[PDB]
Amino acid sequence: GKGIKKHLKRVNAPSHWMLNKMGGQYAPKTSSGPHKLLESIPLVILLRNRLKYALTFDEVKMILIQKIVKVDNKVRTDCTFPVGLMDVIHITKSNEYFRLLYDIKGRFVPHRITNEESKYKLCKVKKILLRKGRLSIAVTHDGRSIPYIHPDVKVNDTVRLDLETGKVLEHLKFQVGSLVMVTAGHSVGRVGVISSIDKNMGTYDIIHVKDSRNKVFATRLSNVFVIGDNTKPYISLPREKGIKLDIIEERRNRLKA
Amino acid sequence: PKSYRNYSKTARNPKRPFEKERLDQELKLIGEYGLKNKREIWRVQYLLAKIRSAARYLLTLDEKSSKRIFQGEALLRRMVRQGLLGENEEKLDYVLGLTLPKLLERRLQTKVFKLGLAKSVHHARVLIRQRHIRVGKQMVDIPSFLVRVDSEKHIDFATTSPFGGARPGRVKRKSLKKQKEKTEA
Amino acid sequence: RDGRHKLRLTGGKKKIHKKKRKYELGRPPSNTKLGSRQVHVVRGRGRNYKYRAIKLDSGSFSWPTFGISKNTRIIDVVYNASNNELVRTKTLVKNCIVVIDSHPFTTWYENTFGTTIGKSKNIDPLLLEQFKQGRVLACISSRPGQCGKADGYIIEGDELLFYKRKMDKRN
RNA sequence: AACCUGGUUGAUCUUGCCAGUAGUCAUAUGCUUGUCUCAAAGAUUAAGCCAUGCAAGUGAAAGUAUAUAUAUAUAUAUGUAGAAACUGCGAACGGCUCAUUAAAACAGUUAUAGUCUACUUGACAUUUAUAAGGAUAACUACGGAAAAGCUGUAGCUAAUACUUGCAUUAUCCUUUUGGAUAAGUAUUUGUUAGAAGGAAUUAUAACAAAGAAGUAACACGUAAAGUGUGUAUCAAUCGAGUUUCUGACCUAUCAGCUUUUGAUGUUAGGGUAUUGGCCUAACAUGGCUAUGACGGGUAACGGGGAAUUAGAGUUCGAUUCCGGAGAGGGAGCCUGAGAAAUAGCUACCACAUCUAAGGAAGGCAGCAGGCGCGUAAAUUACCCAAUUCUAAAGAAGAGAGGUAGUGACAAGAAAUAACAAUGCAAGGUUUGUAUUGGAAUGGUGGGAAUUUAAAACCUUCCCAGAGUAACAAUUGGAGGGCAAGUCUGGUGCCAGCAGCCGCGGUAAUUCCAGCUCCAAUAGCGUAUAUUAAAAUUGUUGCAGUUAAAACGCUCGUAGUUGAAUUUCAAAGAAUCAUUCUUUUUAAAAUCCGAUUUUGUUACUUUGAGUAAAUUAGAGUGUUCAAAGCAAACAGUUAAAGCAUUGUGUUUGAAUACUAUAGCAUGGAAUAACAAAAUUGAACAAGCU
RNA sequence: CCGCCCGUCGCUCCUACCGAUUGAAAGAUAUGAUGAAUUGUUUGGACAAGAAAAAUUUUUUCUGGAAAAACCGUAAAUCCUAUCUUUUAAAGGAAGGAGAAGUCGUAACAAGGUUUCCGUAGGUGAACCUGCGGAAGGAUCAU
RNA sequence: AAUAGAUCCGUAACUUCGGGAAAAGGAUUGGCUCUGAGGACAUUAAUGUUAACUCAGAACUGAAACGGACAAGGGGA
Incomplete structure (x- = not known):
């Protein structure tokens, strides 16, 4: 047949994933989720090759089994979960918070983040739709749908989405x-x-x-x-x-x- | 399937196999640097041609070209670090003048012979093979080792070598002498 | 079943590899006669269901001048722009011309306006005799082989005039 | 390293080829082979045929358990597990191969405003209920058949298998509150209104008709209310199908093709997930072509790439990755979100297995392995520990993959000694050199640490463990090209050698041998192919009087190439003598003396998108190197930094290239095209 | 120049060509004929379930429905015919190349003893001869 | 004896380029019910009256048969 491919060759992996040639023949294909495979990194790589907490995929699974790592204050247990451009991953055991960013070179780096900043994520709006009842909804880069946005919010704007309530606080043009x-x-x-x-x-x-x-x-x-x-x-x-x-x-x- | 481990040649065959003058100067070089075979100086020319081609390409570029002030400085600092250039050098033209003896001077056997230790270049080669020498905290038994300007200060006998303070001498001869002494006494 | 096996733009024939894939598909047609309502179900790509109607007798038909749709029973299909064997064999296709029972429309007109929104339109004379006979002309507008039902609209004005000339300086 | 040399002659200078020369991640083969590292390997021919074994399964809170076992207070209520089986998900990924394929596939570049999209993620829903129904597996017992993933009848029972089925919300008026009014998610049809896009028949909304599928009759438990499973629509994501432009080898001893039988287009429909001659009907006569159509050939899968490269180029690319295709050859089909699937089914052809002869069963171009074919290619090994995938998702599987075995395919490092004294030679007491004679050290054997899934290998440590260091290096040559003997025997135009010129008939510098010497060296020859040499394919860059080569001559279309001319110029600051930077100077619209744009394209400059591997290249002592993408630093065990007592710290995995085509962009030169008179304007006034 | 050298004819070997044989073989297309399997539709119609009555049985109806059949369609496969491609047999014919001291002559190179050569045509054992018109690459750069 | 009419398709060697040729060799043909095409004539761009059999196509139908009898080439090297 010719269904969806479910493997990722090691050399075919995105460059910013930054994996070694000889470290096996495959790379972890990120599960479909809030971010594109190219524009994100699986948390397996995030806390095996960047945070170095786990040195094998099995230890990644052992970490993930305990509901201790939360992506946007909600527990995630998928190994190949796309974390994406900017979002707050909180590890409860060590009580540390990372907001994911790029660097000047162009790779994905976790940035240490304090508690007050860890509840305050940014979302670039991509689409403005209106559904039944003339209710407007924003589709963000995070793969997130936010209903009842202010009318002044435009297509390319960026909103401050609060992590707990999931509500916008203010928007930037x-x-x-x-x-x-x-x-x-x-x-x-x-x-x-x-x-x-x-x-x-x-x-x-x-x-x-x-x-x-x-x-x-x-x-x-x-x-x-x-x-x-x-x-x-x-x-x-x-x-x-x-x-x-x-x-x-x-x-x-x-x-x- | 195929391993992703890169590999490449290190020497180029000379072509015109029986040039008298080239053969004679090659024999000069290998005899007076005590190296083992005609492959070695060919690897040296291969390397030297690599730096020479890099320098020629760089010198083709104009000054103040970012490519130049990056690649040229990288090459210059690498050369002065390997010791092929002195402090009196500042330009790439001086790089272009590098020669086969100036590259062969940095071989480990050449350096240990110059520093002493071995009273012959072949003695130096054989000692390196018998792993009696150290470049400081690490022992290398590769005669083609190229030393940098921060290494010749600490070339000396390996601590595990008999000339470095290890087991003194022939255990067979020592045991025979002690057995004879014990039997006589 | 689509997209290959035929001459190029220039007229040359193309050597064929890549034998037929499922997504080319091409199911057989649904020659929808008129009769007792019966519809089969075809599972298209992605488990999307399609309703292949084999026989219909009724459908929603619209009064477009008044813009009101009423369900009614079709009588006989009398013209189609395509091949005219379809009218002879009485098949229903997307834009064939059929005959419609006018009684629901006449009754609706009575109960709304009286007398035998955008009210007081004065209709047209040429449709009055067609109503009075009892049967009216309509054009199908749905695709019975796709949606499973035969909806349509009453034709009037110069469109009705055109089809009337085309059906019956005439034979 | 931008290179040449032998051969036509009595001798010469040319043209010209033959031969020599070097490389090949380029194959085979011959001789030889002590170490370690690294690692290609049934592509070439037979996409030929296959014995055997394995290669896709899956239950750790969470569908269904009186098969059964167990444990707590006393036959009770809880549990723990659980074969089989039903159900769910996966098996459409992966792996292999390169037969087909020549504007096809592929690559860059678009579109999908012409579509589908499981898992996963975010939003969020509409026309007996203290909980509804039958029916089935497993199982029970009676059976059949030589045999098979064969199954017959009777009896029960479950389920998240299959199937029925139970408030409310919104709107208008006096004007917190009281009255009054209305009620289908996609999808389809008809009539209308109409935050974004570049453009909407868009989102959305109103009215009239239909209208699926749903909105939990389901299972486990988180704060000192959660989860799982399932579900309508939208969105995201993993993808896919089509799609725009541009780009391919040889052949004209292939010049006209296509068009009844769809060829090109229109109209209507059917079909599809969607557009489309994709198909049907009617109609029209179109469509492509010397800028090579249509054919033929390819020992042709395309590309990323490889060899050779001074610059151009020439040749290769089955083969790590991407895309395509196929599963003996065709065709057809079911399930499914996804297949025209092949370790799924159906049929035919060719093979081929068992048979009691009635009938059954098959597809190694998956991993091993066998036959055959051949010049030409490895073990019927071990393991899921790493990488990763599937599952009911720690815990199971995985010939994916990894490990080892065979392995002179290639690639890197590197032994076969070194040293002191006399004797000898050379030199003004310095070098080379047969004697002695003590050190050093691997190869090798053994034990161990370690490594490893286990083992092996490497590394390291300890015992033994070299003088003819018998622990002995070979391959090919010695006329020239081309480094090295007119040394010695044999043969005597024979045998033979010789890439080419040539040698061989008694002195053979060339054969057969010995000695010596030369070259390369654990490697060295041979054959074929290819690149440079070859400026002997010539764009750079050949030659054509006589060496090969100006058509007999002229006309002539395509093609190629095409005179000059339209805005010149002037003035000012900064290094050294100069060089370099800035300003304005016609006309028309914009701003109350000032505010500012003034063909198209080629071409050129800048950017954006530039998959990795490979390449160039920055950093980094893998003991060096091939490599790899790491790593570095204080620390006989603590200072320092920071935190208001503990917490290691600093990092790097850069940059360039990614067509010629496409997107944007500054532009004065050079090139074209546009506009320009038997006329064509502009302005002002009145008129419509 | 006792140089060099040409061709026919003899002999041997190799390569290739023409060739009657309605030659042969293997493929590939195209048409036609037959046509398995099968999507879809229709016809069926084993039954399996419902609804009525008499107090074990009967009619009728409603769907759901297996074989089987027909028709369009997808269409394997076989056969006939035609064409094309590749390979290949063959009496005989006619070339080329190589070999050896073979036979016959003397064509060319000297004015090669008839200057040589071209195109064309005819003839002859062979090289070759002759006619017509050219060229000098001539044996003439010239009353 | 074998077809042999007509329609559609296809047609080689050779050739004096005219032919060969009806080469060879295929398919179809009834009946019925329809559909389409092909003309002429008068009034104030449009409406009526009317004729010929000739082609093309589609359903259905039958013991697959249809130039049904009659009539009517055997081809090729």
Whole structure:
């Protein structure tokens, strides 16, 4: 037959998964869920190859059996569960909270997060639908459906979704001064203020983003994520703060120690 | 199926197999560096051609080209770390002038012979094979070991070697001597 | 059953590999006669059920000028734009012309307006005699081989005039 | 490393090829082979045939248990398990192979506003009830058949198997509150209104008809109310089917193809999940083609890639990954979300098994293995420990996969000594060199630590354990090309050698041998193919008077190529003498003297998307290297950092390339096309 | 130049060609004929369940329904015919190449003893000869 | 003796290019019920009256038969 493929070859795995060639012939195919396979990482990899808590898949299963790891404050027990771009995974045993982010290089890194920030996740809206009764519902990057959004929320906006109540608290627009983070581009993981946008009739829309050091980089509209206004980010960025350094000064300031 | 373990050649055959002058200079080099076979200097030329091609390509680029100020500095620092370049070097042109003896100077047997230890280059080779020498905290028995500028300071006899403070001498001769002494006494 | 085994744009024939897949499919047609209502069920792709009607006698028919739909019984299929063996063998297809019992529509008109929303429209004269005979002309609008029922709408105006000329400087 | 050399002649200079030369992740084969690491392996021919064994199953809270066993206070209420069986999910993934396939598949680039989509995730629902019905497996007993995943009759019983079936919400008025009004999820038809997209016959809403399927008659228990299973719709996700543009080898001794029999299009319908000549009916005569249609060939699966490369190029790509296809050859079909499935079924053809002769049963291009074919390719081994998949999802399986065996396919490191004294030679008491004679050390044998699923291997430690270190290195040559003998015997145009030129008839530098020497070296030859050499395929970059080669001549279409000309210029800051940066200078619309756009394309510049493996390349002492993607740092056991007492810390897994086509983008040059007169405008005023 | 050298005819071997034989074989297409299996529809119609009465039995009806059959459709397979592709037999015929001191002549290279050569045509044992028109690659760069 | 009419399809070697050729070799044909196409004539772009048998297609039907008798080539090397 020709049904859905259910295996993932090790070399065919996404690059940011960052697995070794000789470490077996297969990679864990993420179960279908809230995030795309390419745009996410299974929690098996998250806490075997990143947190190093478990050194085999079986120990990953042993961890997951105890309802101790919660993705967005709800217990998850699927080994190949897609965690996705930004969300709060809380481990109760060590009482630690990680918000998943990108880095300037473009891999998925857990970021240590305090309790007050761990109940406060960001969701980039992707679609605005209206169902029966003229009730509007937002489809977010998280694969989440939020009914009864404010009318002022637009298609590309980003809402602060509270983890417990699942309700939006406030939304951020996509003006030319809005802080943004690139999610899949050549400049994945970069953070900037959106210098400008341009609308292409019937084709991809490009936006040019200004860095902290006045560095302009362009990207497609489909893979940007508003993370705040001009004032400041609404989350805590990793140690590079989303500032991608050039290949020269990166070596230069790595050398000095 | 097929393993994903990469592997590659290290030497290129010379072509024109019976060039008199090339054969004579190869014999000069292998005899005076005490190496074992014509494959070794061919690996050395293969390596040297690699750095030479890198340097030529870099020098084709214009100055202030980020490719240049990255690859050229990486190559320069690598060369000065392996010891093929002195502090008086600053440019890639000086890299281009690297020669076969300047690359053969960094072999482990060459270095131990220069530092002493062995009074012959072949003696150095055989000692390295008999694992009597250490590059500091680690013992290597590969004569083609290339030392860096931070290693020659701590090349010395291996601690487990008889010349490094281990078991003194021929246990057979010592046992025979002690047995004869005990029988006579 | 679809998409291959035929000449290219240029007229050359294509050597065939990739024998028939299930998703090409192509089930046999449903020559829907008119008679006692009977419908079979066909399990299409993805377990979506389709209703293959074999015989129908009634259906929902609409008064489009008034925009009101009433269920009624069809009498006889008298024209179809496609091959005209379908009318002779009395099959129901998407847009064939049929005859409809007009009594439900006349009764509805009486009970709503009286006299033998968007009210007081003055109708048209040419449909009056067709009503008075008792049987009216309608065009099917559903796909009986797909939805399992034969719905339609009364044809009037120049469309009715066109079909009237096409059916009966005439034979 | 952007390379040449022998051979036509008496001798010369050419053209020109033959031969030599080197590489091949390129096969075979010959000789030889002491270590370790790494690891290709029945593709080539026979997608030929297969004995045997295995390769997909699944129950740890959670469908169904009087098969049965057990344990708690006393025949009671709880449990613990549980063969079989029904039910559920999976078996459509994986693995193998490359026969078919030449605008097909594939690749980049789109569309799906033309669709389907199980698991999983988020939202969320409409026209007897202190809980409804029969009917069946397992099992019981009677049986049949030589045989099989064969099953007959009678009797019960369950289920999350199969099937029926039980409040409420919203809206309008006086105006917290009282009255009044209305009630189908998808889907289909008809009539209308109409947050987003680029564009809607979109979302959605109103009216008139139909209308599925559902909304729990189900099982376990979490805060010092949860979960599981199941369910309508929408959305996400894992995917899929179609789809746009562009891109392929040889052949014209294939020039016209297609069109009754769908060829090209229109209309209507049928069919499909959806669009579509996909099919039907009517109609029209179209559609492709020297820019190579239609055919033929391919010892053709495509690509990522490989060899060779100075730059171009040439050749290869069955084979780690992706896509496609197939399961002896065809066709057909059931279940299912998903199959035209093949360790699923049905039939035919070719094979072929058992048979009591009545009848049954089959598909190794899965893993081993066998026959055959051949120049050409391994064990009927071990294990689920790692990677990962399936399940009722710790706990079971998995010839997937991993481990070992065979393995000179390739690739990397690297033994076969080293040292001191005399004697000898060379030199002004320095090197080389047959004697002695003590050190060093592996190979090897044994034990162990360790490793490992177990074992083996590596590493490490301890015993033994080298002088002809018998613990002995070979392969091919010694006329030239081409490094190395006119040394010695045999043969004597014979035998033979010789890639080519040539040698061999008594001095054979070439045969057969010995010695010596040369080259490479645990490797070295041979055959075939391929690349460079080959500027002997020539775009870069050949040649055509006489070496091969200007059509007999002219016209001529396609093709290729095409004179000049339209905005020139001027002025200012910064290194060294110069170089480099900035401003305005016609006209028309925008801003109350100032605010600002001024063909198309090629081409070129920048970006976005750029799967990995491979490649280039940054970092990193795997003892080096091939590698790999890791790792590094203080610490005879504690300072320091931070936390208001404990918690290791610092990291890296970069970057580039990813067509020529497609998207966006700055553009002055060079190229085209557009507009431009037997005319074509613009403005102002009046008129409609 | 006692140089070189050409062709026929003899002999041997190898390669390839033509070839009667309505030659042969193996495939591949196309048409036609027959046509298994089967989707769908229809016809059935073993029965299995319901509804009425008499106080074990009967009629009728309602669905659900197995064999079997027919018809469109999908269509394996076999056969006939035709064409094409590849391989291959063959009396005889006619080439080419190689071998050896074979036979016959002297064609070319010297003005090669008739200058050589081209195109065409005829003839002859062979090289070759001759006619017509050309060329110098001539034996003439020239009253 | 074998078909032999007509319609549709297909047709080789050879050739004086005209033929060969009805080459060879296939399929169909009845009856019935229908459907489509092919003309002429007058009035104020549209409505009526009327004729010929000739082709094409579809259902149904029968002991698969239909140029039903009559009539009427055997081909090929």
